[PDB]
Amino acid sequence: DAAFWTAVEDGDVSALTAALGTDEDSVAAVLPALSSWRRARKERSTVDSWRYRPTWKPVTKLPQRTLDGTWLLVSADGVDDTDVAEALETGGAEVRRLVLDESCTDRAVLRERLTDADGLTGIVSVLAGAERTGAVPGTGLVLGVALTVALVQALGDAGIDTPLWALTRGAVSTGRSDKVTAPVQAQVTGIGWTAALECPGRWGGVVDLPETLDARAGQRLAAVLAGALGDDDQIALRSSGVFTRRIVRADAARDWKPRGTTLVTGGSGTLAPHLARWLAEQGAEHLVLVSRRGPEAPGAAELRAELAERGTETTLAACDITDRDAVAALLESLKAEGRTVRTVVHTAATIELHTLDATTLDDFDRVLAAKVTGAQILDELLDDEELDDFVLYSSTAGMWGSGAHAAYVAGNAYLAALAEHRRARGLTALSLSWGIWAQMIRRSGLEFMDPQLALSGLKRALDDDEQVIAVADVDWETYHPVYTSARPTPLFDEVPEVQRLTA
Amino acid sequence: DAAFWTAVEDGDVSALTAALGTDEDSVAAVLPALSSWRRARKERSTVDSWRYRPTWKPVTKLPQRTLDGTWLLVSADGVDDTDVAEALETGGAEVRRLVLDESCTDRAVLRERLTDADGLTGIVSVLAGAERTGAVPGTGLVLGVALTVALVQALGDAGIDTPLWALTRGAVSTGRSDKVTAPVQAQVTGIGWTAALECPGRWGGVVDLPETLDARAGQRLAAVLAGALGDDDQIALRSSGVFTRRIVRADAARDWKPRGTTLVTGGSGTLAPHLARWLAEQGAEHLVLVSRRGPEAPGAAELRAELAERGTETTLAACDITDRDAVAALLESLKAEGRTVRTVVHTAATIELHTLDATTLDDFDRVLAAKVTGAQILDELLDDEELDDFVLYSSTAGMWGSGAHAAYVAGNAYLAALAEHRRARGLTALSLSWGIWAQMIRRSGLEFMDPQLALSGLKRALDDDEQVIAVADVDWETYHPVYTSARPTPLFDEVPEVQRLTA
Ligand SMILES: NC(=O)C1=CN([C@@H]2O[C@H](COP(=O)(O)OP(=O)(O)OC[C@H]3O[C@@H](n4cnc5c(N)ncnc54)[C@H](OP(=O)(O)O)[C@@H]3O)[C@@H](O)[C@H]2O)C=CC1
Ligand SMILES: NC(=O)C1=CN([C@@H]2O[C@H](COP(=O)(O)OP(=O)(O)OC[C@H]3O[C@@H](n4cnc5c(N)ncnc54)[C@H](OP(=O)(O)O)[C@@H]3O)[C@@H](O)[C@H]2O)C=CC1
C-alpha cells in the first residue's frame, strides 16, 4: 500500500503496470487524476488534524467544600460586590473589601493599599465589572483591564503569594442558549489564562459567573474558590451547575464565494498577501487593502499589480482603523462610488511580546488597540445588512494562554467573544485562531503551515458558517509537556494524542 | 479510502470516474487489474494474521529457591533416576523412588502402589525415558506414554492433589544448534500440556532436560520444580539456562512446484480433496491417494475423474499405513512402474475426542496409530534421496494443549518433533499445524478458513522450507479468555492482541 500510493503520489512509474499488469498505455491515462485525488485527500486529512474548538465540560460531581480564613475582595469604581460578598460570607469566610480608583492603575499607588493584607487565605477580583472606557490617559484601555494588570503586578511586588482569582460575568458561552453579553471581560480572562503561566504560584483561576448569583450558585462558587477542582482553572458557573473548559479536535453547511467588495485590514501585513492572492483565486472582483502605510507600503504596488492581472481591482487605502472618523470617511466614501462591502477580514495587529511584571500600560495598549478598537469600530460602522461575512484573525495565543503574550491573548480572546456576542444578536462573525504560518519557535511543539492549506482551513470555516475555531499544526507530544512544565492543566485532556501521553 | 477501495473491490461503478474525473472509458480498462491486485493483497494480509511459531524465551532472572518436604520420583523399566535424584536431594528434598512395570499401564494396578504416599510435596515423573515399543498388547503405544496416562489417572483416582511434573530429555529445540534427539518423548509433553487443562489443580508442568544434568542445571531444575516460575509450565533447561515457551505470530526462501509423483495419505479424507485439486492446479502430473478404503471410497471415483480432466493421473490405492509390509509393497510397486515420489503429505488421522480420566489405552492407541506409526513407517521407508518434500498435517491441538484431546495432541506434537528431528539430521520435513477449515466450535475463538487461503498458507510454507508453523484463524479476544478460564498461562503473552487484552 505505502509503496502503491508512493508510486502514484510521485507518478512517472510503471511499478504499478507491473504490480497490476494492465498494459501500460492505460496507466498514465488515469495516473494524474488518481495522483490528484490523493493530493486532495492527503490535504483534507492533514488540515483535519488542525482544527480545534474550545468547549465546556460539565462537572458531574462537585466535591463539597467551604472557604476558610480571610479573603480580600477587590473591586473598583461602582462595581457591586455584595452578591459576591454574600457568597464568600455564607460560604464560610471573613471578607476584606478593597475598592480601587483610576489612579491605582499605577502599580506603585496600588501596592500602597496592600498594607494590613498579608496572611490572607485567598484573593478575589471582580475588576472585570469596570468596563468604563475613558479613565486612563492617554490609553484606550478598559478600566478593569488595567487595574487587573496592576493588581497582579503589585502582588508580586509586595511578595504576596496568596492565590488570586478573577471573576467575569457574561464573557463565556457554555453553549446552549448561553449568550455572551459582555465581550469586553474576556480581556481579563485572557490575562488570567496568561498569569496562570507566568506566576503559577499565586494564580487561582478565572470564573465566569451566571446572570444571577443565587445561594446554590454562591455555594458552588465558594467550593470552586476553596480548591474543589484542583488544577482546573477556567470555569464557568451556571444555575445548571459548573463547567470547566477543554480544547477539542473538531469533527471533520453550504458553499462560499467572495461577492461585492471585500475589505482587508492589515493590508501592509505579512499574511495579507496570501489572503489577497487566495481571494483573487475565489473570483474576488474588488479588494480594499487598508493599513496606515497603505499605498506607499513595502510590497503594496506590486501585489496590487499581480492582482490586477488576474482581473481583481485592488485599491490600497491609507487609514488608521483606530480612527472612528477616518474609517467612517473611507467607508462612506466607497459607498459613494458606489461599492458594497460584503466581506471584512480583520488582520490589523501589532504582535509585541512582553511579560506581565515588565509590561506597562502603554505596551498593553499598543498591542490591543489595533485588533480591539479596530473591531469595535468596524462593528459600529459596517452596515450589518447584506455583508454576509466578518472574519477576525486570531491566534492560539488567545484561544488559550501564552507566556509573555498577555496583551495579545487579551486581545485575541476579545475577538472570539465579540464574535460570539455578535452571533448572539444574529450578526455574522467568525474569529479564526491561527496557528503559525510558514526553529527556536518550532521546538515549542508548534509546526508552521502552508499558506494555501491554512487558507483551506478558512475556506471550510467560511463554508460552514463557524463562529470560532482554531487552525493549527501542533505536535502535542512536545507541545503539551512544554506547556504544563510549571503549571499542570486538563485543558487538553480530551485531545486523543494527549491522552496516550498521559498514560 | 474505504469508499475508494470498496468501489474497486466490487467494481462496476463510476463513483471513481466521478471522484477521479478521468473520462470513464479508461476506468474499466484498469479496474479489473486493480480489483485483482487488492483481492491478492487482501488475501496475503489475512493469511499473514494466520501464521504462528512456537518459540523459546530465555528466563533472564531465575528466582533463587529450593525444594522442601517429600517428592516422589516415578520411573520404570530401567530408566535411570540418579542424575535426577541427586538434583532433588542436593536441592533440599527427601526422595521416594517409585519404579513401575508394564502391568502398571493398568490404572488399578498402579493405584495399589500409591499406598504410603499422601501428604507428598511434589511428584516427578521421568516416565518419558521408557521409549520401549513392544510391551503392552495389543497396543502399539510407547511404554512411558501409557504409564503416564496411567499415572495421571491413578492420582485422580487416589485423590492425591499434589502437583505432578513430567520430565523429558531431547524432545524440544530451543533453537540454535539444539537438536531434537528423541521425538518420541514429545508425546508426553503433549499429554502434559493437556493435563494442564483437564486437571489444573494437581498438574505442575513439563520440563525438557539438557543432555547432561550437572549441578547448576540441578539447582535450576530444583528451583523450577519448587515453584520459581509461577504459572509458567512449559520449560526447557539448557546449560545456558532456562527457557519458557511462547506462541508468536510469524513475520510476514525460493519457489515450489510439485514434481514427479506426489503421495497423499488420508486420501479418503475430508481435507484430501481440497489438497488434490490444489496440487493439480500447481501442475501435479501424478497423485497417489492412499487410504484403507482407497478405490471404493465415498468420493474417490469422481475426484479421480475431476483430476483426470485437468491432466492429472491420480491412482487410488487401498493400503493401511499402519502396515510396514503393505506400505512397503505399494512403495516398492510404484518404483517398478517406475515412479519417483518427490512429495509425501501425511494427513492420515482419526480424530476421536476423549478425556484423560475416561480414555483407555485403546482409545489412546486408536487415535495415535495412524498419524504416528504412519509417520515412522513413512520415515523408515521413503528414499530420503530426491524426494524434496515430506509434509505432515497437524493441528493447534498439538502446537499446544486442548481439553479432551490428549491423544491427538500427543500425536500432533510428535509430528512436529519428528519434523525437527529429521531436519536435525539433514532430512526434509514440514509439520504444518492447521487450523480449522470450512458454530458450537466457532465460539471457542477459532474461526474457519477457506480451503484455498488455507492452502496459500501451505504454499508459502513450502516455498520457505519451513519445518514447523501454524496456520490458523483465531479470535484471541475470545479464544484467550476461554483458554485460561481454569488455568492461567503466559504461553500467548507475546501475541500483540493478547497483550492489549491483558491491559
Ligand atoms: N504571522 C503569523 O504566523 C500569525 C498570525 N496570526 C494572526 O494573524 C494576523 C496577521 O498577522 P501578520 O500579518 O503576521 O501581522 P502583521 O504585523 O504583519 O500585520 C499588521 C498589519 O496591521 C497594520 N496595522 C498596525 N497598526 C495599525 C493601525 N493602527 N491601523 C491600521 N493598520 C494597522 C500594519 O500595517 P501599517 O503598519 O501599514 O498600518 C500591518 O501591515 C494577526 O492579526 C495575528 O493575530 C496569528 C498567529 C500566527
Ligand atoms: N478437518 C479439519 O478442519 C482439521 C484437520 N486437521 C488435520 O488435518 C488432517 C486431515 O483431517 P481430515 O481430513 O478432517 O481427517 P479425516 O478423518 O477426514 O481423514 C482421515 C483419513 O485418513 C485415513 N485413515 C484412518 N486410519 C487409517 C489407516 N490405519 N491407514 C490409512 N489411512 C487411514 C482415513 O481413510 P480410510 O478410513 O479410508 O483409511 C481418512 O480418509 C488430519 O491429519 C488432522 O490432524 C487439523 C485441524 C482441523
Side-chain angles (χ1 to χ4, degrees), chain A residues 230-272:
Chain A
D231 299 333
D232 215 341
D233 334 328
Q234 320 183 357
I235 290 122
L237 186 23
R238 307 305 189 235
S239 50
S240 82
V242 177
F243 308 75
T244 64
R245 199 165 91 117
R246 299 282 107 105
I247 302 303
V248 302
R249 302 196 106 96
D251 281 79
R254 209 173 154 182
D255 167 56
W256 178 84
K257 290 181 184 299
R259 217 160 314 124
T261 310
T262 307
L263 190 88
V264 180
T265 83
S268 165
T270 329
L271 288 199

Side-chain angles (χ1 to χ4, degrees), chain B residues 266 268-271 291-293 320-322 347 349 371 408 435 437:
Chain B
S268 165
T270 329
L271 288 199
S291 152
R292 275 154 333 173
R293 295 191 280 232
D320 178 274
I321 30 67
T322 314
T347 82
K371 311 216 77 106
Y408 183 52
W437 304 52

Side-chain angles (χ1 to χ4, degrees), chain B residues 372-456:
Chain B
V372 174
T373 36
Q376 303 150 356
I377 293 171
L378 294 164
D379 179 65
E380 193 222 322
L381 304 175
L382 293 174
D383 201 52
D384 288 332
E385 301 219 324
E386 295 169 10
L387 64 95
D388 283 328
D389 288 282
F390 180 89
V391 176
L392 307 172
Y393 264 44
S394 174
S395 182
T396 70
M399 182 161 277
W400 57 87
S402 288
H405 292 80
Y408 183 52
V409 175
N412 285 331
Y414 175 82
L415 291 202
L418 166 69
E420 294 219 277
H421 176 58
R422 288 185 98 248
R423 294 294 193 154
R425 313 149 50 198
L427 312 190
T428 191
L430 164 47
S431 162
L432 187 35
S433 292
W434 320 100
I436 275 183
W437 304 52
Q439 272 179 334
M440 278 255 301
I441 317 303
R442 174 189 195 171
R443 87 185 212 183
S444 66
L446 291 143
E447 286 296 320
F448 308 87
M449 307 177 290
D450 304 78
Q452 287 217 37
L453 283 188
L455 283 166
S456 63

Side-chain angles (χ1 to χ4, degrees), chain A residues 319-360:
Chain A
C319 193
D320 178 274
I321 30 67
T322 314
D323 187 331
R324 191 155 126 205
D325 291 333
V327 176
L330 168 61
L331 280 164
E332 203 179 342
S333 152
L334 306 193
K335 186 188 148 187
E337 163 73 318
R339 311 295 189 173
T340 70
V341 188
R342 312 281 286 196
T343 292
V344 184
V345 183
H346 177 73
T347 82
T350 67
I351 314 170
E352 295 162 341
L353 289 200
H354 261 136
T355 185
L356 278 170
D357 187 17
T359 187
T360 68

Side-chain angles (χ1 to χ4, degrees), chain B residues 294-305 316:
Chain B
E296 293 126 60
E302 44 228 28
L303 308 185
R304 171 175 47 181
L316 282 135

Side-chain angles (χ1 to χ4, degrees), chain B residues 313-363:
Chain B
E313 103 166 86
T314 52
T315 57
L316 282 135
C319 193
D320 178 274
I321 30 67
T322 314
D323 187 331
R324 191 155 126 205
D325 291 333
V327 176
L330 168 61
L331 280 164
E332 203 179 342
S333 152
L334 306 193
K335 186 188 148 187
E337 163 73 318
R339 311 295 189 173
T340 70
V341 188
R342 312 281 286 196
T343 292
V344 184
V345 183
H346 177 73
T347 82
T350 67
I351 314 170
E352 295 162 341
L353 289 200
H354 261 136
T355 185
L356 278 170
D357 187 17
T359 187
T360 68
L361 299 187
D362 290 26
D363 314 329

